[PDB]
Amino acid sequence: MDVNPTLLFLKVPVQNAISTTFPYTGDPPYSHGTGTGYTMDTVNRTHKYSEKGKWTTNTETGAPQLNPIDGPLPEDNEPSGYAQTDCVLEAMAFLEESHPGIFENSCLETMEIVQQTRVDKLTQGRQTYDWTLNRNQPAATALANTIEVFRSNGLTANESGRLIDFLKDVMDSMDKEEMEITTHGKKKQRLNKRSYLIRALTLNTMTKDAERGKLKRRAIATPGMQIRGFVYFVEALARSICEKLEQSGLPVGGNEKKAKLANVVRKMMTNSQDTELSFTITGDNTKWNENQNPRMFLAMITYITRNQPEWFRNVLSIAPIMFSNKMARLGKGYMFESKSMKLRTQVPAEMLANIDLKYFNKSTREKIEKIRPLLIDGTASLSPGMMMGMFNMLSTVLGVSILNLGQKKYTKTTYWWDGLQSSDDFALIVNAPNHEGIQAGVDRFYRTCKLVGINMSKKKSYINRTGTFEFTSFFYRYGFVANFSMELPSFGVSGINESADMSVGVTVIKNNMINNDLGPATAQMALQLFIKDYRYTYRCHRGDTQIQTRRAFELKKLWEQTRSKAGLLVSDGGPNLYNIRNLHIPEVCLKWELMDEDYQGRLCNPMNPFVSHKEIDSVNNAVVMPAHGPAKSMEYDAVATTHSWIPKRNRSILNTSQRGILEDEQMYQKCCNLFEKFFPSSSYRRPVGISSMVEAMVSRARIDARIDFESGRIKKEEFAEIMKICSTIEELRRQK
Amino acid sequence: IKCMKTFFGWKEPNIIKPHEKGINPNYLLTWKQVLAELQDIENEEKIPRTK
RNA sequence: AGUAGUAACAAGAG
RNA sequence: CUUCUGCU
């Protein structure tokens, strides 16, 4: 009696039981060590897939570059990046003809965006390559460091606060003969124009940790602050265009995406003729990023921006130009060991260009030999392909253009096609009078994609009768099937804080019941398991429990003191009152009617030291990364309570050379937090003004002191002291 | 400790299958050491929460 | 030894 | 030695 769960598929349709085929209850495969091997392999693969292109040497950076555009046509099903410019332009022109005015309207909106976008917008996101330190830094830190460096070098046009001025400053910096940077011993370093250019076009590379569904690991790339400015405008234009494209399912997300896909597919199936046979092709595109050449994006940007003002075309086209000259930083390096001598060592990637080949194994030796010609100042030239391209929307637009080309008015034949495309994934619907027609249509679509460089992965794609398919892990079986295994990692303690965890946990259960088909009984049990995990994680077991923990005494004392036990929060050992009835009610409000007045006052005391409030953009919001896709902002309903504390910060930077940066951060906080005491709306709305902070704070202090005196909130002596101090502050600023 | 005290059939441990790539005159001593530690914490000590 | 698997850990920086 | 750190 050998039990075999796979046999269950003999009765239940695979899609209806697709959750069973997801091992997401196990730990995801992390990456061990450096990402240098994966980066070098990615560069070598990118250049190999375009090896028949034209080799040139840049006159500015001096590094070799490969131009596969207009190269030989693919003579084999092997992945090829030789995209044809005329075919790309023709596809864009047909896209414009099918949707008249799409480019004009998108350009009009994108233009306005450009005019109204501020420099702060670059603070959004994370892990940007700070060229001043050759290391990944938070977007805000990298932006500030770049701004400070530019100001010290005479580039003082970014003070307007408009992103376009910062881009202009970046351009002027590119023309600067020598750059001055600060290091910390607060030394000063001088960078020549060539070296600046190389470190300005450099892309840092790391490994994609915790990725599921893949055996072999891969490498991802992060751009610098200079590139991010133009990339934002290019993505904004692509997003504006994609919003008008029916086949582009990228800009939308969540239920909106599923709704769009269901509507689009439905209409596509409907308009299909009753006498026409229909088939659906499901599959990714192999080596999508390695073959999307930036020159093609430049061509598309130039075509899209036709008739637009020259400044708009230049600002939009700067991004593809810089990406075409991009250099990928190899990374952490490699690690060597001696078994006889029993000692370890690390070789930085900058030493791979000059190190001996006897230390590497056959695979790494071959990879180093193949990348050595492209290695420039520790970075490898990466002109071909688009390493971890941020042009997801632009690539989606190109794919949609190829999809749109399959209308009966463009194919000029009995067969035709349409479908959906998001990034590198697609689902194509082909209608033809007969199987021969379907085959001819599939071949034409595949060949046209090859023409543009896009190349369907025959390895991981299949074609069946229309009605069932898979798109971006969404399984459509005459309607999208509610997969629940994908959301399993979202369960359990989120790990934000003692109060945000509870609200997030119940909110996750509620959302899964609404969206991912979570049954009420399963919801109950889930809730029970979550409360148990929450209690075992925060050591907030019930006061009447005999479990021994280092926090058991305080909880026991609180339980004995309280008269109404049911009113205690779960974080204070109180009983759990949640159920399907109230999964949408925050626990503070849920237990408010039962809380003891003394405990209620202590718990919600606004002067408590644990509660801290950052900008409103980070109030009652958390960042959650599901099984697939990037990080998403989840908004939870929670009352400000002593449990809404902040966890400790990493101190590993406290015993390194860059410890000074943390200190600087402290100083900045010490000033910003003081400004909040002068301008209370500093967090709710961004303050504006060209005056120095000290001048604004002293002026506000003088005004408030007068208003308080006139109203009588302060005495004559207090007012005299305030002004005396204000005059002293003005003198201190002048004395220096 | 109470569960260990429940069983009364304890004998002298003797290796039966040895880990090839490994120094085994170590696992036997480890088990004997664990037993002695249990006697030490069981016979006396304050029965600490962790040993 | 072991984890683990295209590279690490089996402490690290002072 | 002692100091400092477990995402930097």
Short mmCIF file of N, CA and C (backbone and C1' of nucleotides) in Angstrom, two decimals, chain A residues 648 650-652 655, chain D residues 4-8:
data_model
loop_
_atom_site.label_atom_id
_atom_site.label_comp_id
_atom_site.label_asym_id
_atom_site.label_seq_id
_atom_site.Cartn_x
_atom_site.Cartn_y
_atom_site.Cartn_z
N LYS A 648 16.09 47.03 17.25
CA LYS A 648 17.48 47.48 17.22
C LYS A 648 18.03 47.48 15.80
N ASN A 650 21.39 47.40 13.05
CA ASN A 650 22.66 46.71 12.89
C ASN A 650 23.83 47.64 13.23
N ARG A 651 24.77 47.13 14.02
CA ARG A 651 25.94 47.87 14.48
C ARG A 651 27.25 47.37 13.87
N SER A 652 27.20 46.49 12.88
CA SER A 652 28.42 46.00 12.23
C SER A 652 29.23 47.12 11.60
N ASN A 655 32.38 49.11 13.76
CA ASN A 655 33.77 48.70 13.90
C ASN A 655 34.43 48.58 12.53
P C D 4 32.83 46.27 24.29
"O5'" C D 4 32.77 46.19 22.70
"C5'" C D 4 32.63 47.39 21.94
"C4'" C D 4 32.63 47.11 20.46
"C3'" C D 4 31.54 46.14 20.02
"O3'" C D 4 30.30 46.80 19.90
"C1'" C D 4 33.57 45.55 19.00
P U D 5 28.95 45.96 19.91
"O5'" U D 5 29.04 45.06 18.60
"C5'" U D 5 28.46 45.53 17.40
"C4'" U D 5 28.45 44.47 16.33
"C3'" U D 5 27.63 43.24 16.69
"O3'" U D 5 26.22 43.44 16.64
"C1'" U D 5 29.69 42.58 15.74
P G D 6 25.42 43.78 15.29
"O5'" G D 6 25.49 42.45 14.45
"C5'" G D 6 24.49 41.46 14.61
"C4'" G D 6 24.75 40.30 13.70
"C3'" G D 6 23.73 39.16 13.76
"O3'" G D 6 23.30 38.81 12.45
"C1'" G D 6 25.93 38.32 13.95
P C D 7 21.96 39.45 11.84
"O5'" C D 7 22.41 40.05 10.44
"C5'" C D 7 23.05 39.23 9.47
"C4'" C D 7 23.33 40.00 8.21
"C3'" C D 7 24.18 41.24 8.36
"O3'" C D 7 25.56 40.95 8.46
"C1'" C D 7 22.36 41.65 6.89
P U D 8 26.58 41.99 9.13
"O5'" U D 8 26.83 43.07 8.00
"C5'" U D 8 27.64 42.79 6.87
"C4'" U D 8 28.03 44.03 6.12
"C3'" U D 8 28.92 45.01 6.89
"O3'" U D 8 30.04 45.37 6.09
"C1'" U D 8 26.92 46.11 6.10
#
